[PDB]
Design a protein around this nucleic acid. Structure first.
Ligand SMILES: [Mg+2]
Ligand SMILES: [Mg+2]
Ligand SMILES: [Mg+2]
Ligand SMILES: [Mg+2]
Ligand SMILES: [Mg+2]
Ligand SMILES: [Mg+2]
Ligand SMILES: [Mg+2]
Ligand SMILES: [Mg+2]
Ligand SMILES: [Mg+2]
Ligand SMILES: [Mg+2]
Ligand SMILES: [Mg+2]
Ligand SMILES: [Mg+2]
Lengths: 252, 129, 151, 123
RNA sequence: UAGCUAGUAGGUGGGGUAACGGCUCACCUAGGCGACGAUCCCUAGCUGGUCUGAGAGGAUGACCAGCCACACUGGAACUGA
RNA sequence: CCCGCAGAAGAAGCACCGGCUAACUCCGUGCCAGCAGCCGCGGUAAUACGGAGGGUGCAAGCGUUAAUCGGAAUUACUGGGCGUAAAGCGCACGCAGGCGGUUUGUUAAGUCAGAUGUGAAAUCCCCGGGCUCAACCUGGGAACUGCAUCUGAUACUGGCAAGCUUGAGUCUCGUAGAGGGGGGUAGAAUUCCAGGUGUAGCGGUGAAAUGCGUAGAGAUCUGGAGGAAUACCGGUGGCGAAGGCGGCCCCCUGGACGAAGACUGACGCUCAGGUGCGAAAGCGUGGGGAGCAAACAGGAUUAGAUACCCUGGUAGUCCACGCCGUAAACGAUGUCGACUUGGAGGUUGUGCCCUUGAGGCGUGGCUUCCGGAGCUAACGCGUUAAGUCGACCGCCUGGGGAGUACGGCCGCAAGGUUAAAACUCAAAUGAAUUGACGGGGGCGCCUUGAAACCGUAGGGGAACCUGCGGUUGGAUCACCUCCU
């Protein structure tokens, strides 16, 4: 597990977040006081979840912070952010740092709240961030990056050396921000069709899509959509993936 | 495959000398006989002989002086990969003249000591001491 | 990039103003070393010697109460013949003058720029970018430099 | 390996750069101090180093070391530079010349003074 | 930097030069060149020499002597040995 | 140029002084900062900073920078390397190219000898001369390694001609073998189906859970299905170029080794380009799918767990036909040929002796482990060299950046392939020695219960996790001074 150590990049992250009132801000994983303090400072009042009840006591008893935040002590994947968006008057800014096994769940739970979230701002490991922003025709591309880029516009904020962290890992990591689309540029009939199309395709990414999505559609459907079935799964943009999803859903 | 019948006899001389053998033997050839003769003529061996019609064999009787081999160095400069020729004056000195080089001249094979005073350059076979 | 930028500014201000010099810029870089770069000017002049003085002072007066010291070293500098600049008042001294800018906003109609300062707003730099004109917030920029014409 | 290989391809003796290339083999070069600054080398290292960004007549701009005591030297001022490596510093391969065209001699110094650009005391 | 080339390669005949010659022009043949590096691109005037080196080598061609090319830039041509 | 006149009178500096490197001590200084080519110098003395005295060197100069050669053999013609330091193509065949046994004649291209013409002068070098000397100038010689031509010489090489049998290779007879290709077939085994008997459990783990069973599971009997693999022999064992090859029989088919002759007559070796073979993974097209199993899914575990555990499970794994073209494809060891102490085995021919049957003398081939000489940085290698050598090919030239960019080529795609540089560092590295080891382990003493990678494909909080198959290179880390 990790949390940051050096004021230069702490200050860079909290300043790049631009946390002020007129925003429905909520931290998750406040962790070490050093990086939760500047955001709880700049916001006149701030909401937070900590997963740990002991750290939640450490910070809630801290007079810089307990008087200056409202604090919650539970697994955030239980947490009803759609009601917190109502209680905070406008859709949320959700942000912070974590041990990040939970990362994959965080994204899906955030996406379960794409209406209730205004934006997300989080640190993550280099490979998963570069995947999350990957262009369709790259080895870094794939199913989770597809779903992420489907739900939101995604934007690297800044990148951080491993010696910057309190227990310094071996692994460089970056803060990234993302934005649930105000209207989906890719309208879809359902997301489960996307999720299964993408998993089938990426479970078979070395073979032709005739030997991946063509295990379900015909070649004449695919070419009828304007898609060459002789491509590989990692040639395919989210645009034609959502077109396939709509085709599956509407022809079923 | 075999591509230097002369380096073969010289390496047989070396290896036989190092193995303390009283004599060593080779498939004979006219040039080897002439070589064996000039190095007997400079005393580097006890004797040489040839035995048998049709296939021939040339035997070299290796010389040991008190406790040791007489030849201590023998090496061939005209690689079949690149031949070597020298003018009458350019005939080199082996061990500053203590040793011998073997020269095939257009008047036959001989020592460099013979060849320089004979005024003939030629092809150079090898050095010995 | 800096730690506690206001605290740092005041701790630096004490020897700067004791020397009667003026601050201009504070910036830190993180890399093979991690290091702090101070721009000071005084319009009578800054010599190498004036940098030497204030640097030996901050090398004591900051260090003894450092909020952080990771890989640390620092330098103090005159702001160059192409000068880094940081505030509304700076750009306001230099209205009509050619500039380059790089931004915390990072979007097409590219937020990396060459410009001539058109006018200053309380929140923004207005600038003749690309021979067009446009305006960028003091908060949506992050670094800028002036008279890049001088190599 | 074989002589036949050596005639098929001769010995490739390597080239090497000038390690001080912005001179173009001029014994010295002139420039202007595009900025000037002073640095501590390290967290415990107290020995301040005095350094300049300087643009040469040839349009190169490079770091150069300021040896010895202070000067007038300030950004519109002009400098003669020559080869010389500050071993402890990264890539600093150019020394400024004491007693050059905009550069004072070390007035105090009584030793090695032809390095430091300063004339015999007037006794 | 792998292929290159149509007066290109060769021939006959006409024209042309002080002189041989696609030098050039008509026809005629389909050649000619190149991985023993042509073609293409970069860089350079050349040499006796010079410096270094134990030597082999390496570097280099300022001065002096020989050869070459150029004369505001790009085109021609007059005259004359 | 000589001569007269007066007077030491008019005329010395610049580096450096810890070591390399000739030359040292006082003083301050505080790591203030200076010092610097490098190694490095310093707080309380510093022979290294600054100052002083003292010293050393060079001198009308002395230092600094730049630049070329040197040193540097550090591109290794002379004069280097490639098991592990960088380096032997994954393997093979083969064109061009290089190289080539042996005898005789012939030729005379190379080669050798001699001559002749030429090789500008100057410069260089030698021997002289001349400026008072020197620099400088200059006489004469030598030198100008060469080129051309003529003349001989004939060993060697090359050409030509003729042969030769030792290299190469054909034949006859045997021999051993998971060599390959094609086609049948068997006994185990798992799963599955169909019953039959039967009944509350089964299953799984550390324990659980998910899972399965009262629609009868599980178990056990019978009968059937289907796909895959060959228990044991089996080995420090054979075959194969390498990759690799293992139930059995047939069919086609490659190579090898021994035997004893016979035959051809140097037909040879190596090999840039070229061509082809080439594990595992993955791809292409169409089948198959038992068992296993990336991905995935679900249950657990853990601070978290993405792992490790379990219940599932797709691709894949199989087949035919295309492709890819890489592997620690490694003996990390290019191919071919000759030579050079021994010793104990293994395996497979063969000869002679067998008193037979065992034996015992030999004698090929292949192969394993020791080890002499020699070699090697050392480790080690060692007649199957890493010894001694001959011919040719491939490859390396500090560490990173980087087998990465870019371009070309190639590939269906993955990617492959060829392949930089800027930039950056004073190392990077191999072997081996001594302490730690340490966790010990045995009995204060001797001394160890203490995975890395390769290729490739996919997941992806990590470094990482997973699948396939290959390799073994199966781990540590390192502080207070010195002269004869
Ligand atoms: Mg004509
Ligand atoms: Mg030398
Ligand atoms: Mg000394
Ligand atoms: Mg070497
Ligand atoms: Mg190596
Ligand atoms: Mg090999
Ligand atoms: Mg011959
Ligand atoms: Mg002959
Ligand atoms: Mg397939
Ligand atoms: Mg396979
Ligand atoms: Mg590549
Ligand atoms: Mg293998």
């Amino acid at each position: 597990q990790n949390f940051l150590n050096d004021q230069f990049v702490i200050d860079s992250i909290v300043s790049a977040i631009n946390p002020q009132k007129g925003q429905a801000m909520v931290e998750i994983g406040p962790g070490l006081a050093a990086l939760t303090e500047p955001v709880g400072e700049r916001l006149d009042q701030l909401t937070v979840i900590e997963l740990d009840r002991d750290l939640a006591a450490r910070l809630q008893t801290h007079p810089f912070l307990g008087p200056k935040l409202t604090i919650y002590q539970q697994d955030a994947m239980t947490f009803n952010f759609g009601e917190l968006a109502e209680k905070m008057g406008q859709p949320l800014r959700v942000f912070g740092n974590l041990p990040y096994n939970i990362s994959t769940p965080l994204m899906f739970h955030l996406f379960s709240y794409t209406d209730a979230i205004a934006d997300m701002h989080f640190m993550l490991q280099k490979e998963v961030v570069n995947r999350l922003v990957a262009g369709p025709n790259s080895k870094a591309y794939g199913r989770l990056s597809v779903m992420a880029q489907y739900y939101c516009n995604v934007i690297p904020v800044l990148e951080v050396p491993p010696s910057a962290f309190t227990p310094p890992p071996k692994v460089d990591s970056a803060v990234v921000r993302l934005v649930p689309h105000a209207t989906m540029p890719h309208p879809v009939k359902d997301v489960r069709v996307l999720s299964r199309i993408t998993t089938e395709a990426f479970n078979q990414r070395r073979k032709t899509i005739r030997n991946s999505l063509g295990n379900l559609f015909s070649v004449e459907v695919l070419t009828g959509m304007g898609i060459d079935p002789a491509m590989r799964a990692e040639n395919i943009s989210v645009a034609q993936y959502c077109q396939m999803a709509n085709y599956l859903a509407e022809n079923a | 495959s075999m591509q230097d019948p002369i380096a073969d006899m010289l390496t047989r001389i070396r290896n036989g000398q190092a193995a303390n053998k009283a004599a060593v033997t080779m498939p004979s050839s006219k040039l080897k006989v002439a070589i064996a003769n000039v190095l007997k003529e400079e005393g580097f061996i006890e004797d040489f002989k040839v035995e048998g019609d049709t296939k021939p064999e040339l035997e070299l009787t290796l010389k040991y002086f008190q406790g040791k081999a007489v030849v201590e160095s023998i090496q061939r400069v005209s690689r079949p990969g690149l031949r070597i020729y020298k003018r009458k004056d350019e005939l080199p000195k082996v061990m500053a003249g203590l040793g011998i080089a073997v020269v095939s001249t257009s008047k036959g094979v001989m020592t460099d000591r013979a060849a320089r005073q004979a005024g003939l350059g030629g092809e150079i076979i090898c050095y010995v001491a | 990039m800096s730690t506690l930028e206001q605290k740092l500014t005041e701790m630096i201000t004490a020897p700067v103003e004791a020397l009667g010099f003026e601050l201009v810029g504070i910036e830190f870089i993180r890399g093979r070393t991690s290091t702090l770069r101070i721009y000071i000017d005084s319009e009578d002049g800054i010599n190498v010697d004036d940098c030497a003085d204030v640097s030996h002072q901050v090398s004591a007066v900051l260090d003894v109460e450092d909020p952080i010291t990771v890989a640390y070293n620092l330098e103090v500098s005159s702001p160059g013949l192409d000068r880094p600049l940081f505030t509304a008042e700076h750009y306001a001294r230099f209205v009509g003058e050619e500039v380059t800018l790089v931004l915390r906003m990072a979007v097409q109609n590219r937020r990396k720029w060459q410009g001539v300062i058109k006018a200053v707003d309380g929140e923004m730099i207005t600038v003749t970018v690309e021979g067009k004109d446009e305006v960028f917030a003091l908060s949506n920029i992050q670094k800028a430099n002036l008279v890049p014409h001088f190599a | 390996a074989t002589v036949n290989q050596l005639v098929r391809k001769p010995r490739a003796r390597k080239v090497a750069k000038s390690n001080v290339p912005a001179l173009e083999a001029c014994p010295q070069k002139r420039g202007v101090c595009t900025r000037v600054y002073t640095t501590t080398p390290k967290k415990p290292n107290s020995a301040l180093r005095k350094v300049c960004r300087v643009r040469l007549t040839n349009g190169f701009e490079v770091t150069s070391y300021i040896g010895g005591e202070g000067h007038n030297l300030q950004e519109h001022s002009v400098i003669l530079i020559r080869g010389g490596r500050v071993k402890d510093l990264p890539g600093v391969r150019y020394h400024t010349v004491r007693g050059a065209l905009d550069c004072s001699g070390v007035k105090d110094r009584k030793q090695a003074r032809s390095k430091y650009g300063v004339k015999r005391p007037k006794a």
